[PDB]
Amino acid sequence: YYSDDGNYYCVRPCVSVPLSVVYDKTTNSHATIFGSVACEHITTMLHQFS
Amino acid sequence: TIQKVTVDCKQYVCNGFQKCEQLLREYGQFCAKINQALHGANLMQDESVA
């Protein structure tokens, strides 16, 4: 898109980051993997445990 | 080996729109079956590698 301000922007799509759940059935314990995502992006796009 | 791929069936079919998501349910429990089949394939691949 060629904007009115004079800048050109590449427009990508949105609304989904990859998520996996590690599950241990015997101890009923679990953990979450945000695959291919650095922790900085994760810590940015939530509001204290969104 | 082959590349291990999984599919977020709900996101792939309906792209997040709720009107689509409502109508997805008249087709059996299709997305769960897709997920289970891909999970089993990837698990068999991992056991083969080991």
Side-chain angles (χ1 to χ4, degrees):
Chain A
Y1 181 74
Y2 275 96
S3 187
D4 276 342
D5 54 38
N7 269 348
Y8 170 92
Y9 311 83
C10 302
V11 204
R12 297 184 46 256
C14 59
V15 70
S16 263
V17 333
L19 211 150
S20 313
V21 175
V22 187
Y23 183 50
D24 179 50
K25 185 179 155 53
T26 69
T27 66
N28 216 9
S29 200
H30 72 277
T32 286
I33 309 173
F34 301 86
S36 286
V37 179
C39 290
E40 279 71 5
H41 210 281
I42 295 309
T43 57
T44 55
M45 61 80 71
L46 74 165
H47 44 85
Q48 194 61 28
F49 280 35
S50 172
Chain B
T1 51
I2 58 152
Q3 208 170 47
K4 276 177 304 170
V5 188
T6 191
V7 173
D8 192 352
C9 170
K10 184 177 180 180
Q11 179 53 32
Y12 183 88
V13 180
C14 277
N15 304 332
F17 301 91
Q18 319 80 51
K19 191 32 187 165
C20 178
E21 293 179 353
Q22 171 204 317
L23 312 159
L24 200 41
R25 316 172 172 140
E26 310 308 314
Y27 304 83
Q29 184 177 2
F30 161 92
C31 277
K33 291 191 200 91
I34 293 288
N35 275 267
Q36 289 149 23
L38 290 176
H39 196 258
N42 299 344
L43 197 56
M44 183 278 288
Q45 272 271 312
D46 268 2
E47 293 179 353
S48 175
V49 180

